[PDB]
Amino acid sequence: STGSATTTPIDSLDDAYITPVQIGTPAQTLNLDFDTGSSDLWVFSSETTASEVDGQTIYTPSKSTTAKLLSGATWSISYGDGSSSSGDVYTDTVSVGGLTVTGQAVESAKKVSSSFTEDSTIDGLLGLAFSTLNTVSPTQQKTFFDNAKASLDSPVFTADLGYHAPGTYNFGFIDTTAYTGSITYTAVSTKQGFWEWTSTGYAVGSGTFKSTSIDGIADTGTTLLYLPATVVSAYWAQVSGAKSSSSVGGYVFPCSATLPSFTFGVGSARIVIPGDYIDFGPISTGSSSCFGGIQSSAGIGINIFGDVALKAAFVVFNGATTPTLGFASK
Template sequence: MPSYSTAALVALVGTSLASPVARHEFQKRDTYSFRQVQRGTYTKNGPAQVAKAYKKFGVSVPSVVNAAVSAAAAATTGSVEATPEDNMDSLYLCPVNVGGTELQLDFDTGSADLWVFSSQMTSSEQTGHAIYKPSSSATKKNGYSWDISYGDGSGAAGNVYADKVVVGGVTATSQAVEAATSVSSSFTSDTDNDGLLGLAFSSINTVSPQAQNTFFDTVADQLAKKLFAVTLKKGEAGTYDFGYIDQSKYTGEIAYIDVDSSEGYWGFTADGYAVGDGSVTGSSFSAIADTGTTLVYLPDEIVDAYYAKVDGASYDEQQAGYTFACSTDLPDFSLSLGGAKRTVPGNYINYAKVDGNNCYGGIQSSSSIGLSIVGDIFLKSQYVVFDKTQSTPRLGWAQQSSTSSSSSNGTASSQTKGSSSASAPAATSPTPTPSPASTGSGGGFGGSGIFPSGLPSGFPSFGGGSSGSSSSQGSGFSESQSSGSSSSSSGFSQEAANQAFNEALAAAQAGGF
């Protein structure tokens, strides 16, 4: 039975009682329960559980069991949930255990650094974020540093540790963790996001004097298959699967194309494109697949050809991109990849409202960027395999087995973590620094400079709330509450407080308090 100290109970009671409650309202409860929440999935390892039982009861683990554990570990697989941060799918966050602390990280196939908010930053920069504190098993890599910048001028820098990192049950026991000592304001203001996990090629890692391996490269040899598969979703949580291909997540065949990794990215050549029900136009071009970029950036002739089929669409100089009436039915868009036609539904291409009547397109020009980028607007319609099982890396493309039922105006389901109000795209052109092309976190090019923060009064905020709002990053949830506001306006419930106290009292009494 658990025991409860007087101080602990007083603290718990004090937390529960935000306003006076009459003593007669407190009632002893005979039963209580807590709901468990699953944060990741991984393949069950029977031998590991046997070994765990031996160790728990102080029995030496037989060599045959240790051998079985090692054999099972050599075929590791795991899956982690990727949740949209806001209602426009500007970026997706995944729970990652770094040195014993769970952080919410943006997985980015367009960069190769695993960097995190850390205890070495100023207290003001840490506010609202889950923070990496080097664990007792961490080793500082003396003389090593890192410095990364993004196309909007945002960036971060710091020093380097080797520490344990766990993603969906897949463990890297000595992973390079880049602990931030300073970050730009756009990162600190995005309190949902605690850093970034790069999944490009390790050759573009920014650690000096020697580049470090990405998480994927660190664990690749222990995976059942040397690959990871990405299933991003519109307006709902998707997954990153490591070491296996999940046939339930796609339809038809996977079309594979070779990857050009010479620049450190998952580069490929598309055979052509199609608009709506039209036939494929055989105009090949090179691009990269980047989960850290929100929109799709393509050659001008392709972009112009698409919007020529959109009624009333025009290039808006102030928005640095194509806009159209929000009520417009957009045509689908397809890429020919490995001889197969892969399609994003037209409603996915309606990214965000510019004003009350006009919306911003999810396909824009790559001319000022210097490379074409297939970002989340397209990727969230696909099951994409990032494959290193062959001598030449390759990308696999298949249509997802189901699509989101989200409406075409860019509004996501209630499962998204971010703000519920849409914001107009930034007026300046969202251009990334070509190396690295990482773009997905911090309010830069990945989100097209958009990290909406406004919420209706009394509405709970999942990050990016108004200045001065409190934040509990452990769950990614924060409640905005202005000074002097009533309990109801901040989401506080007197009934809930009473229930919390009753449950705490019952637990204490059950423990012999």
């Protein structure tokens, strides 16, 4: 089997992407944030505290003839950005782009933190990291991809995120028309439960490539690109007027600037992030200070190849017995 679904930016900055997902019988379609940095599939629901729902579409398990309460199971997740959610668990039929999994754990939110309430466009998350990170207790549950894997034509999914445009998540096949050149594969460590790999270096604009190992994770659920302070300082030093602002929370730059590209290495291959992709717009409405899309990881503990980086590539998440990541230009 295969599946293919369009993913759409939630706003004009590509802050996140939503993909329609069919849950239950008859189908309830919710727009979920596909997240290669976590491993829970959770949804706003008829159980979510009413004051914490503000425009999201909810899953109502009582209206699904295939929903079953997973007795005794609870979940609670805290994400790297300080947001969180928790609740109980149903199993139900979940379909993405024509690919159907029966008995998928659907984690129903009883509580969500403010940033989720404030994002009316995101009805939940669909985790695509390794199932070892799933938070369901006392019996950890499998991700949608893990459940679908055996049925797929090939045990892979691909992320083709658009710049200010829709893109595609495919399951079970590699669309050879969706990228240019060849796909370069690189080793993955699953020891932390993430799609963790090592970039071979970077360049700023037309500058020379610096060969240096940069360990980080491919995280579709993170908006920006978070890299070591040395790398980030070298990037922003090429933008007149750019500075790190403690009050704003990162590097900012004059909105009148033209940003240089940023290149990252994948083995001997190179992925070029155009400068435009690094512009996240005014820090507040009407400001001439703009927020940068490349930021320091120094306070995180891990480097994060978020959407800024991933949207410049066609990315293969290869879930073979020894997982690997593939990157192609497009």
